[PDB]
Amino acid sequence: NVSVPWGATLSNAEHQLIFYFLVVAALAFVAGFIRTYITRNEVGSRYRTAVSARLGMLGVALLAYILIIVAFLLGYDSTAGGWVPNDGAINIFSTRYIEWTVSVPLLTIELLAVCATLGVQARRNTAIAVTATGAMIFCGFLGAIVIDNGTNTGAFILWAVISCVFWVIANVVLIRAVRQSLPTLTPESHTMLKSAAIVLLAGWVVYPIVYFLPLFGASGGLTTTILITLTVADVIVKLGFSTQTHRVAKLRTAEDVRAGDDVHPESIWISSVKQSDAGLPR
Amino acid sequence: NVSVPWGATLSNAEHQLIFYFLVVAALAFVAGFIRTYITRNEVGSRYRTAVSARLGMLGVALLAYILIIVAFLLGYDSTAGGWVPNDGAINIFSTRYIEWTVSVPLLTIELLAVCATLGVQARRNTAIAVTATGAMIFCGFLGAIVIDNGTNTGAFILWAVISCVFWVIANVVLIRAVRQSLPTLTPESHTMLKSAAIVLLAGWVVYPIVYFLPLFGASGGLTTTILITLTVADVIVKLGFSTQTHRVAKLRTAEDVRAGDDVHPESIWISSVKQSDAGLPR
Amino acid sequence: NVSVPWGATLSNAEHQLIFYFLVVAALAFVAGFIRTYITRNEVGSRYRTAVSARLGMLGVALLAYILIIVAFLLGYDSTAGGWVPNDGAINIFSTRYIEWTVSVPLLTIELLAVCATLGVQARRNTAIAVTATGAMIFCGFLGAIVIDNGTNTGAFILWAVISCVFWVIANVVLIRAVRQSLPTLTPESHTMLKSAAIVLLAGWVVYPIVYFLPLFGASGGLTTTILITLTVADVIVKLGFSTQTHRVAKLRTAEDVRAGDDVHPESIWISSVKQSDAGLPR
Amino acid sequence: NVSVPWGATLSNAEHQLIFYFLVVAALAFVAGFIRTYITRNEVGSRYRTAVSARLGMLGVALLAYILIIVAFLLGYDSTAGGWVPNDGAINIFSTRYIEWTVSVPLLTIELLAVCATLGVQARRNTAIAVTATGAMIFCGFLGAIVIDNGTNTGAFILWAVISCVFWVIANVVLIRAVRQSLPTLTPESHTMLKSAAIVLLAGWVVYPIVYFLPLFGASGGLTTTILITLTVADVIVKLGFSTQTHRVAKLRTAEDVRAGDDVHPESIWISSVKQSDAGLPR
Amino acid sequence: NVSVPWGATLSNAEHQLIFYFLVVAALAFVAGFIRTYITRNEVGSRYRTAVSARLGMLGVALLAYILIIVAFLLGYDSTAGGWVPNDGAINIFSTRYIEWTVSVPLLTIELLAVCATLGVQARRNTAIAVTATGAMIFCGFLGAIVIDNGTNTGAFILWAVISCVFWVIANVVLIRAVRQSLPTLTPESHTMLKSAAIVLLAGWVVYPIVYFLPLFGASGGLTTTILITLTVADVIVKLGFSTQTHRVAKLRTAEDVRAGDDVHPESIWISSVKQSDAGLPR
Ligand SMILES: *C\C=C(C)/C=C/C=C(C)/C=C/C1=C(C)CCCC1(C)C
Ligand SMILES: *C\C=C(C)/C=C/C=C(C)/C=C/C1=C(C)CCCC1(C)C
Ligand SMILES: *C\C=C(C)/C=C/C=C(C)/C=C/C1=C(C)CCCC1(C)C
Ligand SMILES: *C\C=C(C)/C=C/C=C(C)/C=C/C1=C(C)CCCC1(C)C
Ligand SMILES: *C\C=C(C)/C=C/C=C(C)/C=C/C1=C(C)CCCC1(C)C
């Protein structure tokens, strides 16, 4: 059966670890937001979407993680028997689905931004991906939170299945876009995009796995394993992979500048190598 | 007869779904605000008003949606019989009228900003539209919230009628402005404006319809349908259509640059096609 | 006698209307703040003071209106007999005097910024105006709030009289500055300043009138009329007239650019007419 | 004996006046912060420290004054016998010492920034001044707040004496720096610095005087006089004198530009006279 | 044996001093954040990482210190017997470990940013350092907070030992990077980096020492000594040493500009000496 994670009483260790990771995440996102803002003009206007998506995703994550922290502080009470969940502990689990609903479509927008697609294909791509990913999150939220208060095993499973269909649709769309890109890019750029895609699409699998952990039992330790693992995953994907597309966009900006297709006000540096020189509109 | 939406007790599913959409909206607006800010200089000084209106509308929406979220958390209490409305549940419904009062006039300002009107006509247009739209919202607020606490069917209806007159005035003004524009623009620009207008003016109809749903009865289902539908509509219109005028303004900037009427510091890209090159004041 | 406004019990309609206007104001100011910030570089460095004053005034208004909203939510308690003022309701009335104390001197700074005055006269002007206006607000605050808790009719009147002397001093100073300007400006600029002054100085009269309403009796109606009217006045003067000086400053920037006295990085547009072209320091 | 200021019960007038000045200060600082930010690029990179110090000081003041306002609202309760101090009223007095601890060293940094000192002397100057001033504040905090809860007359006095030694050290350092500057500046610049120093160093005396007013007795009148006087002093020194160094820095920037030692992207204006023209790096 | 710091009752002096330092820190960080932001463009794009890391670290510190202040206000209750720790007092100690978890890896990123390393070595360096330092903090958090609620002496010690291994790894990595840099830099730059490294790595020792103070007993004195000393250390290292790398980055920018390897829009000043002139992309 499904044993909802927010039913469990947390040990002190457990409650302490959760607060640590939750706040470390929020602070890492603040740092990431600052970095992304300070470096927004390393990218040409042609790829500004990549930058905006990413800065958006980091802002969203930062706010969502503030809510999660509030929900956590207002969701358990120390009672000699550790910390006992109140009726707002479900909101620690809900807010995360909230956050993914915005953030994951932003990720698709970012990745498509640095691909080589034009016109209808590019608008079709962005429509299907943003749709399929928000649907994928919402189906999850249905199974895990909304129907029967999380407790209906058949709902819980069936909605995860539906969710997995939207997950395959999103991937196919993205994977195809990245692989219609690669023929038109330069070796260095081809490589960079291929690698960014993989990094950006591979760690999605974590989420579905964590989703099904409520099936193996209910414990404060299982709850801590769920909340922590999701927090780490979010930091790795949103923060850790926040520079993959930035490097792609920078190396693309620089190639345009070297081809005389554009100019850029400052030199561009990637891995401490100069990619392009500063130049003025001539 | 009118059954006010804030009278109904919400199931857990219902209360969970509402919080989801409300917060997803707030987070989508934060993302939108960041995008609009990061891309404010893609537009020439001639059309900066379009940008400011839009960035204003997104900032307003973001704050309004924070209030709505507060009002929601402070408006229902879990009581075994789901969530029971308290005396601040009306403020969940009131805050939205508040938000439209600023946001809808901002929308009119934005659309007129990218039209081809000069002098008195342009000042008359903006005066009538900003007036007619704020009046339209306020009449709504009267019928639905203020008179008799929402419960007077004849008020509720009569004020919606008055509201619909201000709605026709606004449309006529706007529609005429857009159609005095189109003769002077270029094919590509003509098309773009025509389409932006339609997108921007068509989904207004949703609001009046939702307004009259408190007449079909009272339920937490119905209450939930109301709050969600309004949230989706807001996201579609404020966020979804936040780029229509931006593209119009960009393509207008670029045409000036190509005509030698202006210069722009960076190249302009629309749908991954280069519209204009960067240039310096010569 | 004086019947203090914060003594009255508010109907539900009344309490609803007040919250509407108060929050609509705050949101309008957020929009205004964003506009003013986004357009700060339409003005040359010579007139940057106008811009800073205005952006300051809008920031102040936005914060003050947040306080007023708090004070309102924490100042009346629903009790079957509508909303009954607690002992913090006075703070709804006090915060507004607070706000004017900063905002009105900012207005004088803004208007003098776009006048044609040099050296001692300009420093004397700004000193007398900023003094006379802050004094004018403080005398008001004395009569209405501080002495006898607002209830002393002779105080209430006598301090309003004193306040009116500082009001005449401020006007004389300002009016003379604007009329020593006009001889040195261009027709187009002369006209623009004259008009901005009138708009900026005419709606001051509202405030003194509203000030003496507590003398015609006490009612929640009267209390509501007071709070709303002040809110509308603030929006009209701070937001509505936030572009008068901006246009003046823009047309002055542009005239310098056309005379070859300065350069400006971007073209300047006023009412959809181009005033000056972009240019580089030569 | 010392009668601590936070022991006194405040009349309604008194409590009203205090809240007025405290919030007027916070709002004035917001305005000042906005001005300083909007005008940060009127100064060359050579004197950017002056700007950063000042913008820092205004940000600090704004936050400190928000705390003081909180502390005030949470420090007295209306009890028929006016407002009666709780055991957090001391924090109204403590927060101010907190604020000076950052702000006064920032002031020294700002003033030294616009002086003509190089190498060791400049690093020695900044070290002694920042040290002596933070020490001066902390000694004050000891005598007034920490030892014996403020109530030890001999502590109170002895720590103020120590504090006055650090005050003389700071002045000597600063005064000497300003007077080793003046021989190397231009008449116009010499004059400007001399005047800025005097303005910046003269109103320090207020603070020590107010410090000893708890020795003349205890009253809500006296308590009110203390809190208001400190608030006015802060506004005069932090806000009122926030442009003295800015003018100094601007006139220094402009002189470099006129000497061909630097360039500046925009013209520089001081008192409505043009000081330097815009120019590009040649 | 370990006597947890959050067990002790604080005298009034003690509670007053702690609040002072905690808030002085937060305010110093706000000032630092403003400085770093205002001066972000003194550094070339090649070394922007240094700037972003530092601005990130200061933003993180500012938020962390706000939490610590909250935790403090909500962690002790005045009970005639001074201030008595409640059960959130542990969170005053926990939040600091939280803060170091982000901030210390940011410090390593900053220092490596201004070193002369390319390709794999630079990516290996940053990976090991960011890992080793976050591990070092987390091991600390285990021993001090999580296991046995802080009270297990053998845990407390053993985890500090493990922590010290990660501390040696981090240092070796960093020290080697800085000393593979120095052969390729200029005298002036070599010197500057060597000095920045020492300053940046030397005051790490404080933290481990303070960590083992809970072993010398329990007291409010000892508790106070701990919290203050950590606060001062943080201010010295995060704020005090926030300019070391900035100077390094500036002098490196300037050397590139003098070599004709880059251009920089503004002149660069270090210690009131001009390092490079402004220039345009040629
Ligand atoms: C914050 C960033 C990311 C990439 C979060 C991703 C979330 C998913 C990939 C969720 C997928 C789900 C599936 C496919 C099936 C079970 C329900 C889930 C929503 C967890
Ligand atoms: C937030 C964006 C938009 C466009 C909101 C629009 C609101 C309306 C178009 C409201 C119209 C009304 C009418 C015409 C009649 C009933 C009362 C309403 C206020 C709902
Ligand atoms: C927020 C903007 C404005 C211009 C507010 C203005 C306030 C006044 C002009 C107040 C004037 C007063 C007078 C002359 C006499 C009675 C007391 C008052 C303060 C209301
Ligand atoms: C916020 C700005 C300023 C300049 C505040 C200044 C504070 C002082 C100059 C304080 C001086 C003190 C002395 C010399 C002796 C008594 C203790 C004091 C801290 C009040
Ligand atoms: C906020 C800035 C800094 C540099 C903080 C540094 C923290 C450490 C160097 C901590 C080291 C530890 C060790 C090596 C052993 C005991 C556990 C500690 C985490 C305190």
Numbering used by the authors:
A (entry chain A), B (entry chain E), C (entry chain D), D (entry chain C), E (entry chain B): 5 to 286
Which passages does the manuscript contain on this structure?
Here, we describe a rhodopsin group found in microorganisms from cold environments, such as glaciers, denoted as CryoRhodopsins (CryoRs). A distinguishing feature of the group is the presence of a buried arginine residue close to the cytoplasmic face. Our data suggest that CryoRs are sensors for UV irradiation and are also capable of inward proton translocation modulated by UV light.
For an in-depth investigation, we selected five representatives of the CryoR clade with different seven-letter motifs: RREAEDK (CryoR1, C. levicorallinum, GenBank ID: WP_166787544), RRESEDK (CryoR2, Subtercola sp. AK-R2A1-2, GenBank ID: UFS59673.1), RRETEDK (CryoR3, Cryobacterium frigoriphilum, GenBank ID: WP_166791776), RRDNEDK (CryoR4, Subtercola vilae, UniProt ID: A0A4T2CD69), and RRDTEDK (CryoR5, Subtercola boreus, UniProt ID: A0A3E0VLV3). The transmembrane part is mostly hydrophobic and occupied by lipid molecules as evidenced in the (electron) density maps but has a narrow polar region near the W40 and R43 residues in CryoR1 (Y41 and R44 in CryoR2), which, to some extent, resembles that of the pentameric viral rhodopsin OLPVRII. Next, the cytoplasmic part of the pore in CryoRs has an additional second narrowing formed by the C-terminal residues I238 and E287 in CryoR1 and CryoR2, respectively. At the extracellular side of CryoRs, we found a large water-filled cavity, between R99/R100 (in CryoR1/CryoR2; analog of R82 in BR) and the small (single turn) N-terminal α helix, capping the internal space of the CryoR protomer from the extracellular bulk. Our structural data show that in both CryoR1 and CryoR2, the arginine likely plays a triple role. Second, the arginine decreases the pKa of a conserved glutamic acid at the cytoplasmic side (E113/E114 in CryoR1/CryoR2). In that case, R58 (analog of R57 in CryoR1) forms a salt bridge with E114 (analog of E113 in CryoR1) in the ground and M2 states of CryoR2 in almost identical manner to those shown for CryoR1. Thus, structural data on CryoR1 and CryoR2 allow us to conclude that the reorientation of the characteristic unique arginine at the cytoplasmic side of CryoRs in the long-living blue-shifted state is likely a feature of the entire clade.
